[PDB]
Enzyme design. Structure first.
Site, PDB file in Angstrom:
ATOM      1  N   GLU A   1       0.786  -1.218   0.000  1.00 47.95           N
ATOM      2  CA  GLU A   1       0.000   0.000   0.000  1.00 47.95           C
ATOM      3  C   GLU A   1       0.817   1.265   0.000  1.00 47.95           C
ATOM      4  OE1 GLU A   1      -3.186   0.182  -0.275  1.00 47.95           O
ATOM      5  OE2 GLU A   1      -3.747  -1.891   0.154  1.00 47.95           O
TER       6      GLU A   1
ATOM      7  N   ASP B   1      -6.577   6.742  -4.581  1.00 50.21           N
ATOM      8  CA  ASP B   1      -6.061   5.412  -4.755  1.00 50.21           C
ATOM      9  C   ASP B   1      -6.118   5.010  -6.235  1.00 50.21           C
ATOM     10  OD1 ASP B   1      -8.622   4.739  -5.174  1.00 50.21           O
ATOM     11  OD2 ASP B   1      -8.792   3.435  -3.388  1.00 50.21           O
TER      12      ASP B   1
END
Ligand code: CL
Ligand code: CL
Length: 162
Positions: free
Chosen positions: A11, A20
């Site tokens: 991540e 994202d």
């Protein structure tokens, strides 16, 4: 290698609100803020999550706190899910981490929808599950990460992360 290190690699760590892979407002270590297109909504959710007026920026410690909470929530969600708990209980430690990774990324509901793959993991048919998992939007949208998680389920080791 452990779950924390594993997700930190997939991540990343960002101290300012960012978008994202799907274009959603996020912060820290993959901590989704909202699906709303509005930054203000995002700032509001951040402040409420941290407990202060943040100006859209947090500290490393704060990011790690959200992280701890999110890993914990992911584990608890698996254990409380009827379709997931049995799979998780059937797995060895490494593969358990890989299931957590998936849940963290796509949510309990999302993972629970992979009916066929779930059955193959439970039966320990590694190679077959790996082929089936690749037939998904998940894999087509984030192929490098999906490949890492899938290899983890296939081999039962952390080679994809080393
Ligand atoms: Cl929160
Ligand atoms: Cl990717």
């Amino acid at each position: 290698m452990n779950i924390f290190e594993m997700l930190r690699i997939d991540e990343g760590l960002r101290l300012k609100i960012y978008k994202d892979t799907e274009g959603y407002y996020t912060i820290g270590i993959g901590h989704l803020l909202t699906k709303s297109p509005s930054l203000n909504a995002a700032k509001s959710e951040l402040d409420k999550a941290i407990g202060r007026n943040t100006n859209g920026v947090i500290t490393k410690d704060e990011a790690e706190k959200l992280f701890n909470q999110d890993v914990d929530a992911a584990v608890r969600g698996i254990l409380r899910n009827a379709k997931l708990k049995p799979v998780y209980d059937s797995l060895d430690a490494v593969r358990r981490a890989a299931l957590i990774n998936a849940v963290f990324q796509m949510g309990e509901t999302g993972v629970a929808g992979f009916t066929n793959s779930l059955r193959m993991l439970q039966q320990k048919r590694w190679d077959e599950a790996a082929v089936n998992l690749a037939k998904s939007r998940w894999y087509n949208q984030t192929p490098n990460r999906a490949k890492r998680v899938i290899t983890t389920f296939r081999t039962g080791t952390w080679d994809a992360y080393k």
